Structure formats: C-alpha cells, structure tokens
C-alpha cells in the first residue's frame, strides 16, 4: 500500500465555501481556506486517534462505524444515524 500524502488540499476551495454557505456566510476572505483546512485536520486527528484506539483495543484491523461513533461520543459530539 502506497503512503498517502497531501490530501488536505483535497478539501477544495469550493467545498469549504459550500460549508460556509450552509453556515450562513455571505463573504469569505481568501485566507479562510487554509485556516479551515488546519481546523479540519486537527478535528479529524482527534476523532481518528480515539477511533483507532477503540479498534486496536478490540484487536480489529478495521475501523468500524461504531468505533467512530464512540470516538465522537466521548468528545461530546454524539452522532445519530449510524448505530449505538
């Protein structure tokens, strides 16, 4: 398996705008996109670390939807519609 690199740029500029539109933002500065990518990366690192911790505890090689749901729940971000 090849090592992935430079995927945070896959969160394209228009994708961040659409998230801003759903957030009710009318005008966006050009420096917002890099900040948003950094924030998203921090959030995903925090969630995925806990998900992988749960997975490793279960001795699984596969991160299941329940691992992600538990990881979100223990961060005060309960998620409905995926189990639990």
């Amino acid at each position: 398996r090849k090592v992935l690199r430079d995927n945070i740029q896959g969160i394209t500029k228009p994708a961040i705008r659409r998230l801003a539109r759903r957030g009710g933002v009318k005008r966006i500065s050009g420096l917002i996109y890099e900040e948003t990518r950094g924030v998203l990366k921090v959030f995903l690192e925090n969630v995925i670390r806990d998900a992988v911790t749960y997975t490793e505890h279960a001795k699984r090689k596969t991160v299941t939807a329940m691992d992600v749901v538990y990881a979100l729940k223990r961060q005060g971000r309960t998620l409905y519609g995926f189990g639990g």
Binding site: R22, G24, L72, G76, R77, T78, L79, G81
Partner: protein, 107 residues
C-alpha cells in the same frame, strides 16, 4: 392462562421486559426495582412520541408521507426543549435550519 406482557399491563408500547433486562445487565446497580423498567419505558415512549409527532408535522409541511432525517432535524431544532435536550447531538443527513442573519440581507 395466556401470559400477559408487562408492556400491556403498563399500557405501553415499548418493551418493559427488554428494558428491565438491559437495566439488570448494564452494570447500573446491584438490584433493579420492578417499577424502574416501567417508568423508564414510559419516559422513552413519551419522548419518542414527542419527536415523532413533530417529525410527522414537518413531513406534512414538506408534503411528504414519510419521515426522513431532515424532518427529525427540523422537529428537534424548531422545538426549544428538544433542542436543549439534544444540543450536543448531530443528526446524520439532517442539514441546518434556514437562518440568514439580517445584516446580510440586501438593502
């Protein structure tokens, strides 16, 4: 005589026996009272009925016969008390309430 479900005795739809077993096996207390599962089932059923009634109203507004996550989200967020109850909850495929700040509108 045919066995009577504890739900029917309590006048509920939710499973009193299953909730009792979950309480007993959930590592909550050494012992579980007889009336605890009945009360818990009644509360869960009441909350589900509230959410489902608001979701059905939302579905009717959107001219849909069927409840989808969007209607659950609208019902939960348009109700102050349910919104407070589920403040830390994200509903998959729920979207957001239409809300544009007045300062952003034209003119």
């Amino acid at each position: 005589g045919k066995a009577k479900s504890r739900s029917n005795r309590a006048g509920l739809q939710f499973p009193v026996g299953r909730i009792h077993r979950l309480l007993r096996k959930g590592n909550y207390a050494e012992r579980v009272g007889a009336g605890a599962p009945v009360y818990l089932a009644a509360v869960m059923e009441y909350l589900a009925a509230e959410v489902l009634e608001l979701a059905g109203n939302a579905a009717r507004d959107n001219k849909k016969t069927r409840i989808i996550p969007r209607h659950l989200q609208l019902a939960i967020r348009n109700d102050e008390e349910l919104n407070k109850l589920l403040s830390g909850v994200t509903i998959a495929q729920g979207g957001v309430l239409p809300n544009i700040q007045a300062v952003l509108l034209p003119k």
